[PDB]
Every structure is written in C-alpha cells, then in structure tokens.
From a paper:
Several lines of evidence support a role of CMS/[name] (Cas ligand with Multiple [name] domains/[name]) in the regulation of Cbl-directed RTK down regulation. CMS, also known as CD2AP (CD2 associated protein), shares overall domain organization with [name], containing three [name] (Src-Homology) domains, a proline-rich region and a coiled-coiled domain, and high sequence identity and hence, it has been assumed to belong to the same family of ubiquitously expressed adaptor molecules and elicit similar biological functions. Recently, [name] domains were identified as a new class of UBDs. In the current work, we have performed structural and mutational analysis of the three [name] domains of CD2AP and the third [name] domain of [name].
In light of these results, and due to the higher [name] [name]-C affinity to C-terminal GST-tagged ubiquitin reported before, a NMR detected titration was carried out with unlabelled [name] [name]-C and 15N-labelled C-terminal His-tagged ubiquitin. Interestingly, our NMR titrations suggest significantly tighter binding as well as different areas affected in ubiquitin upon binding compared to those previously reported by Forman-Kay and co-workers using non-tagged ubiquitin. Although it was stated that this mutant abolishes ubiquitin binding due to the replacement of the key Phe322 residue as in Sla1 [name]-3, we observed binding with a similar affinity to that observed for the wild type form, indicating that [name] [name]-C displays a comparable behaviour to CD2AP [name]-C towards ubiquitin binding. Bigger differences are observed within the n-Src loop. This loop in CD2AP and [name] [name]-C is one residue longer, resulting in a different position of the sidechains and creating a shallow and highly negatively charged groove with the RT loop, accommodating the ubiquitin C-terminus on its surface. These results are in contrast to the relative orientation of the [name] [name]-C domain and ubiquitin in the previously determined complex; the difference might be the result of a distortion due to the G76C mutation and the incorporation of a MTSL molecule into the ubiquitin C-terminus, as well as due to PRE constraints sensitive to minor alternate conformations.
Author numbering: -2 to -1, 270 to 328, 1 to 6
C-alpha cells in the first residue's frame, strides 16, 4: 500500500540526507513525519532522502495493470 507524489519543482540535495528530485519525477512517499518541519522522506530511482513537501503534489493511489 505504497503513497506517491509528483515533483512540481526541482531540488538538488545539499547533504547526504536530502533527495534530489526533478519535475515530473514520481516519488515514493516513505514518511511525512521528519525531524524538519515541512520536509518529507521519499524514495526515487534507488535513492532516498528528505525533500521540501511543497515541491510535490500528492497523487491518487490508482495504478494501471503491470507486466
């Protein structure tokens, strides 16, 4: 039952704990409760980290059939 969000603004990680996200990226949301107010933890294409929560848009959980 994984949550997903779509990146609306890009963000380049500035330390080890951040996640670099590009516009259009579909990020797996891991945790909304992080040490920093306004930041979420996510996973993307093998990496993981925190990003600002208003750089992204929550998606409906609907997914087309896969192979």
């Amino acid at each position: 039952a994984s949550d997903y969000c779509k990146v609306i603004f890009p963000y380049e990680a500035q330390n080890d704990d951040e996640l670099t996200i590009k516009e259009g990226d579909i990020v797996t949301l891991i945790n909304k409760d992080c040490i920093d107010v306004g930041w979420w933890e996510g996973e993307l294409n093998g990496r993981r980290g925190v990003f600002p929560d208003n750089f992204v848009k929550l998606l409906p959980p609907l997914e087309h059939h896969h192979h």
